[PDB]
């Protein structure tokens, strides 16, 4: 049977040699065809089509990357932007003042960490002061 | 033991292609059946005997 | 490498826990604030 499964993260042509290793590891009749629209085709024995779909889904599930939207109540988003910019992806909106993220659930762990890290608001500094002159 | 399993572990610090020759040294040091495949998404694949995969 | 924010006025760091050792050392090294120099002075004229 043929199995159609996805790897969104990066183009699946990257797996052609090692997948044809499982097309070599056992008998042929298989196909594994990588559509540039980014889905995945196998055809062949359900067992080897499975192990193939397991390598395949092993590049699916592997590198997960998407977008987050999280409120920044305090530190100006555009500032959050800048101050991450030095780091070497990222979005935010200052309509909402919210960090958006593009990337890993490791980027989701550490960048919820930095969602939280610079949220803090500086205490008032008494930047200006009204002084009551006694004499002058 | 001697079982053949695959282990997926990370090196975040720098791309793990840097280890391909010496890791295939442990793919050479003992019997094959192994793979060690370095995903540009930066994770790490081994397959083979749990000892040499260790 | 190095960052900071002057919203917070805080050193951010990118790099080693050796960079964490030595750059907590330099977190501490230049934190000091100079004592007031009496940069300006009000002088009371006795005669003139």
UniProtKB/Swiss-Prot annotation, chain B:
Task: Outline what the protein does.
Answer: Involved in a type II secretion system (T2SS, formerly general secretion pathway, GSP) for the export of proteins. Required for secretion of cholera toxin through the outer membrane. This subunit forms the outer membrane channel.
Q: Give the record's family classification.
A: Belongs to the bacterial secretin family. GSP D subfamily.
> Which proteins does it associate with, and in what oligomeric form?
Forms a cylindrical channel with 15 subunits; unlike E.coli no 16-subunit channels are seen. The closed pentadeacameric channels are 195 Angstroms long and 145 Angstroms in diameter. Each subunit turns in a clock-wise manner around the channel.
Supply the gene name: epsD
| Parent-record interval covered | 121 to 174 of 674
Q: Which organism is it from?
A: Vibrio cholerae serotype O1 (strain ATCC 39315 / El Tor Inaba N16961)
Q: Which cellular compartments is it found in?
A: Cell outer membrane
| Entry note about domains | The N0, N1, N2 and N3 domains are periplasmic, while the secretin and S domains form a channel that is partially inserted in the outer membrane. The cap gate extends out on the extracellular side of the channel partially closing the channel. The secretin domain forms a double beta-barrel structure; the outer barrel has an outer diameter of about 110 Angstroms while the inner barrel forms the central gate with a small pore in the closed state.
Name the UniProt record assigns to this protein:
Secretin GspD
Q: Residue ranges of region N1? A: 3-54
């Amino acid at each position: 049977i043929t199995q159609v499964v996805a790897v969104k993260n990066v183009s699946v042509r990257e797996l052609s040699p090692l997948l044809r290793q499982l097309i070599d590891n056992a008998g042929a009749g298989n196909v594994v065809h990588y559509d540039p629209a980014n889905i995945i085709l196998i055809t062949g024995r359900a067992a080897v089509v499975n192990r193939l779909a397991e390598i395949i889904r092993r590049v699916d599930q592997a590198g997960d990357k998407e977008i987050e939207v999280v409120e920044l109540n305090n530190a100006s988003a555009a500032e959050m932007v800048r101050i991450v910019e030095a780091l070497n992806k990222f979005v935010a909106d200052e309509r909402t003042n919210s960090i958006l993220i593009s990337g890993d659930p490791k980027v989701r762990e550490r960048l919820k960490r930095l969602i939280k890290q610079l949220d803090v608001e500086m205490a008032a500094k008494g930047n200006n002061r009204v002084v009551y002159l006694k004499y002058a | 033991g001697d079982e053949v399993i695959t282990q997926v572990v990370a090196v975040k610090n720098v791309s793990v292609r840097e280890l391909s020759p010496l890791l295939r040294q442990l793919i050479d040091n003992a019997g094959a059946g192994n793979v060690v495949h370095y995903d540009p998404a930066n994770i790490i694949l081994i397959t083979g005997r749990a000892a040499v995969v260790n």
